[PDB]
Amino acid sequence: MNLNATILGQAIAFVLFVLFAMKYVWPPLMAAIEKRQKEIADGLASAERAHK
Amino acid sequence: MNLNATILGQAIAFVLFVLFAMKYVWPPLMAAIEKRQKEIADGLASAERAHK
Amino acid sequence: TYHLDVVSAEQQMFSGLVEKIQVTGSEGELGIYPGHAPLLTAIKPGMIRIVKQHGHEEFIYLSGGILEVQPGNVTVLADTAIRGQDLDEARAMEAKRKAEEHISSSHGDVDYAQASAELAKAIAQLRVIELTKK
Amino acid sequence: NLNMDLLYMAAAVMMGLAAIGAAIGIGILGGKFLEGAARQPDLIPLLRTQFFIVMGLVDAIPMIAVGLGLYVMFAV
Amino acid sequence: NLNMDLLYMAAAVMMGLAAIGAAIGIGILGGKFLEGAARQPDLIPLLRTQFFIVMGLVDAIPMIAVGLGLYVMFAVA
Amino acid sequence: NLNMDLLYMAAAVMMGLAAIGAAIGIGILGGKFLEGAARQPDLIPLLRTQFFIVMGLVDAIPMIAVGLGLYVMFAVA
Amino acid sequence: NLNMDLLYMAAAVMMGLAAIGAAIGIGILGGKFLEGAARQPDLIPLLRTQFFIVMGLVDAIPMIAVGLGLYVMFAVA
Amino acid sequence: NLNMDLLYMAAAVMMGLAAIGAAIGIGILGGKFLEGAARQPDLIPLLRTQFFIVMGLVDAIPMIAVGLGLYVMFAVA
Amino acid sequence: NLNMDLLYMAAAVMMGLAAIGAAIGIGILGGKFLEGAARQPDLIPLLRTQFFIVMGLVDAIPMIAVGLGLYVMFAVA
Amino acid sequence: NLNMDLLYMAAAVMMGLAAIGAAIGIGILGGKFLEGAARQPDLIPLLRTQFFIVMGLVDAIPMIAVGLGLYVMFAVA
Amino acid sequence: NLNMDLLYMAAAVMMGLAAIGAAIGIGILGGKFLEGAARQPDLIPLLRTQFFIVMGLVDAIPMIAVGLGLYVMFAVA
Amino acid sequence: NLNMDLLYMAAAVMMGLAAIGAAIGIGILGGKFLEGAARQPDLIPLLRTQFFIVMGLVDAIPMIAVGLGLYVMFAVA
Amino acid sequence: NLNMDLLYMAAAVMMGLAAIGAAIGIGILGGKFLEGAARQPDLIPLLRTQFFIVMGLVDAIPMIAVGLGLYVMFAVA
Amino acid sequence: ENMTPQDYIGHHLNNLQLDLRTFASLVDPQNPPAYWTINIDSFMFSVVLGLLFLVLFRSVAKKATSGVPGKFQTAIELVIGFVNGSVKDMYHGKSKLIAPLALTIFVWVFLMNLMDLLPIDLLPYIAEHVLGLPALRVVPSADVNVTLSMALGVFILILFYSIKMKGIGGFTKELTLQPFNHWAFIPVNLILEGVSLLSKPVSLGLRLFGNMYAGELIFILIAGLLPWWSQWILNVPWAIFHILIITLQAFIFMVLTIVYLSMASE
């Protein structure tokens, strides 16, 4: 079919989109989930210490 | 064969597809949102009671 | 119709005439009906439903045992079994608490051989307690 | 001439392959229907209803083949 | 001429495939019937009625094939 | 001339496909009949009755194939 | 005339092989569906959903063959 | 005279398909015979009787296929 | 004209083989998935995940065949 | 040229189909033999004596096909 | 001349058969994978590695056939 | 020139059919071997001896088929 | 024409049937490998060594065909 | 007006090819052998949809809050969690590259597939008459260029981890010694390894390509063959089925990428 220089342009485009997601998108996301988990587990700890 | 006719037929097909999608895919979509909301809310309320 | 009997190995759980049932088995839960087959084996932690004359049911916890199936009068031999209103939702929730702790407190295969059974017993209680509300 | 006997041959091919398809499909499907019904003779009507449904599916493609084979034998 | 030489071939292939399909289909169905009956013979007449009910649809298509094969062999010739 | 070559080939295809069909069908049916006979002996005559009833239907189409193959071989060519 | 009498054979083979493939694939799959529906009738709707999902997977490639068959039937002749 | 060379091919197809049918059928049948012998070793001279009763039906069509193919190869050719 | 004509049949055979391979493979795989779903109703979201895992690999090669068949019929024609 | 060539082709089809028949039949039969050996190992010297009896019948009909194949190649040339 | 389309026919047949083999082999293998995963759901990460191991052996000859078919399709033809 | 150029095709048919027969026969036989090794693991060095006993009988016919194919390619053609 | 295209066709037949045989044989064998690994999760090293032993013999006879097909495409043609 | 089914199919099977040797538009009956002839239409669609992925994810990532999320932020965190869970199932190393790689693959492939749901003549018509372009087609993932480009990037990434610790250690030791530590099975098992290894990425490419290529084809066939009053009843079911197809293909391309790299490192 039409194997084209488009394939190489799109390889560079693939790695560029990977880089954009790698630098800007993904790094800022991790913290929220851990904070929300922490504020639920500490309550179970508090109940245990009340009983103790 | 007329091409205006083909466009008309494609239009009818697209309308029927869109209506089907709106009436079987979108009604149950928000289930995950509700799951996360309810789980988080119950956990945090129980932790509040644990602190007091 | 047909007759059924249940024992908890240190207590009698049921005895009387019955129409149809639903029970657990060697691998999982199973939809039972009268007149289908002639052979028998073991039970995984589960429960049983007893629909009697005029269509009245009851719901019993089965912690483990063996099931006859083949005869007109059938019976369940259970190493431990509890009546559906001797147990309660609070008791099954305590079992849930125990099992969810033991999952966190079991770390090897040898001890998980017991932790898994404890979890299965808790889950069986949690299904029978919901079926009890019918 | 040479045209029409080859058309008969092509019709033979489609409609014999469709014969294989439908026959073996219903054979397998009804084999499980009968063993399940032998295990559950009280539920024969229920499983037979299911059997109509999955019969529709199993012969969906086969009936497409068979109809188009009719077009090759009788519609040309 | 060449017509009859190819038409006998066409009827042959159609009816051969029809034969294979019908025979092996009923083979599969009947095996499960016999095993289940061996476990509990009280169901034999019942399951044999079910057996004909299903075997009709098994023979549905292959007899279209056989009818058209006989037609090609004796009427198109 | 050109007739007998293709007519023998047609009969050959017909009876070869019939030989596949009948053999495989009776293979499946008889295999389940034998595991039933091993499961419950002293029901061998009853299961053999059912076995012949089903075998009669299994060999239906293949025997038509065999008959018309013999017809093509020893009547048409 | 000379050109067209091979194109319908091409289409014929496409659709026949695809039809057998899809038919027996759905046969295996739906046979397992009914086997499963024999244990717990209560799960018959849930398993019916699973069955149509996997069945949608099964017919994928055969549908491509069927579509090109229709293309040949109504545009290539 | 080209007539001979197709007749050998026509005998070959018959005997090849007969070999496949009559080998795989007896394979499937005798396998169940051997598992029956494995369960009930004191019944073996009974299941041999049943096995030879059924094997003669498995070899009904294939031995005709071999007979007529071996006829075509020598008498006709 | 034969250069144009024969690639229709070549693409036809590629796509027929692809259809049978894909359909039967998915049939077997999904049938095991359905029985597994039947015994343990709780593990359907797990067995479904592993089912898609394995299905990707099963359909890897049939996609090769069917894509190249489309290529043959439309690109070189 | 093409008489002596097609004789070799006929022998090829004959012996190939015979090979399939013999191989698959003994594969099934010996698989059941091994299961019987696994379930009751001290009983192997009896089941093997039954195996060779059944195996003789299984290969009896493939082997005359093989014999005629070598006859076609070497004797008829 | 016809060498181009004959070479595509050869490559087409080889690659379609490769698709058959790979699809059904991985189907059987992954079906047993899922049957094992349903029974011991805590051993999915281990069975899913053994599946890599034997799946790598399954596809070897089919992948070689696909590569050589591409060679004939694009380098030779 | 076509006379030997088709002898290569004849050998292809012969030893390819031999290949599929031998491969599938050993596959079934070894499948029962491994299941036996799983049921009685302390028994492997006995059942493997039996496996090598019967695998020679399985390959007896395909090996001579392959040898004659190699002879046809390298000696005759 | 007739010299090279027939050699590519012969190699296609050889390596396609080799693909079928090797892939499906190893599929059947590895299925039992994984079933045994599901029943005896402490025996996987032992059963995989047995699997290597059987796998070598399964692959051996197709590999002659694969190498010889490479010979035909690259040395003869 | 010379419209026929085959002519219509011919128009729809053509890209907007632009030859960079003279920077001129290549009309459909005019196809050169040169390499630098980049296709405008599907390539533009591809990069635009990738940018759409990045733009939406950045317009949420620059604000995302840890309270009860908004109704738009929740969808993006759901896809984030889906990708994170899929990677975490199949990977134990500490490299942060796997996760954004999988996320981009999933969403970009999904959007490019989603283009296949559109009416086949809408955008190509607007391209031909409003603008004047000779041809257009709307599905980037229905191209060998897109699919094998992504697959080739994945191949580079395969050899990356295979040549890190594995490369100095395992890759050499494994290729020379394992499985049977013999001199004659080094070449044979290298042949097996070579064909298997190279088929791993190419299969990703051709799998996704085949599905999208054939779906676009099915829409084209329905539009080209059947009269307008009958097209709808066969066009709608295919669209419903193709929703499932596109979701599964995005998922599978992602998943197999993760498995390959995970086995390369661990």
mmCIF file of C-alpha atoms in Angstrom, chain A residues 4-44:
data_model
loop_
_atom_site.group_PDB
_atom_site.id
_atom_site.type_symbol
_atom_site.label_atom_id
_atom_site.label_comp_id
_atom_site.label_asym_id
_atom_site.label_seq_id
_atom_site.Cartn_x
_atom_site.Cartn_y
_atom_site.Cartn_z
ATOM 1 C CA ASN A 4 5.187 6.940 2.944
ATOM 2 C CA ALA A 5 7.551 9.418 4.646
ATOM 3 C CA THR A 6 4.406 10.076 6.698
ATOM 4 C CA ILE A 7 5.385 7.001 8.742
ATOM 5 C CA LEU A 8 8.619 8.662 9.897
ATOM 6 C CA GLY A 9 6.963 12.017 10.495
ATOM 7 C CA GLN A 10 4.411 10.174 12.626
ATOM 8 C CA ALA A 11 7.140 8.318 14.508
ATOM 9 C CA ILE A 12 8.579 11.683 15.544
ATOM 10 C CA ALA A 13 5.034 12.840 16.321
ATOM 11 C CA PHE A 14 4.452 9.728 18.453
ATOM 12 C CA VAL A 15 7.558 10.384 20.548
ATOM 13 C CA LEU A 16 6.709 14.103 20.816
ATOM 14 C CA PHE A 17 3.236 13.352 22.177
ATOM 15 C CA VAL A 18 4.835 10.863 24.578
ATOM 16 C CA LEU A 19 7.225 13.626 25.695
ATOM 17 C CA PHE A 20 4.395 16.141 26.153
ATOM 18 C CA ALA A 21 2.457 13.675 28.306
ATOM 19 C CA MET A 22 5.680 12.747 30.131
ATOM 20 C CA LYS A 23 6.647 16.309 31.086
ATOM 21 C CA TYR A 24 3.361 18.167 31.617
ATOM 22 C CA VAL A 25 0.389 15.803 31.954
ATOM 23 C CA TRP A 26 1.333 12.804 34.120
ATOM 24 C CA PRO A 27 3.741 14.124 36.831
ATOM 25 C CA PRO A 28 1.216 16.416 38.601
ATOM 26 C CA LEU A 29 -1.450 13.718 39.152
ATOM 27 C CA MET A 30 -0.216 11.239 41.795
ATOM 28 C CA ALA A 31 -0.696 13.200 45.029
ATOM 29 C CA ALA A 32 -4.497 13.556 45.235
ATOM 30 C CA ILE A 33 -5.297 9.837 45.478
ATOM 31 C CA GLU A 34 -2.789 9.292 48.291
ATOM 32 C CA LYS A 35 -4.087 12.287 50.255
ATOM 33 C CA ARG A 36 -7.669 11.030 49.971
ATOM 34 C CA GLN A 37 -6.656 7.495 51.038
ATOM 35 C CA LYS A 38 -4.672 8.830 54.013
ATOM 36 C CA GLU A 39 -7.622 10.817 55.350
ATOM 37 C CA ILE A 40 -9.749 7.636 55.451
ATOM 38 C CA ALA A 41 -7.172 5.259 56.952
ATOM 39 C CA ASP A 42 -6.360 7.641 59.814
ATOM 40 C CA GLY A 43 -9.984 7.409 60.973
ATOM 41 C CA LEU A 44 -9.742 3.639 61.361
#
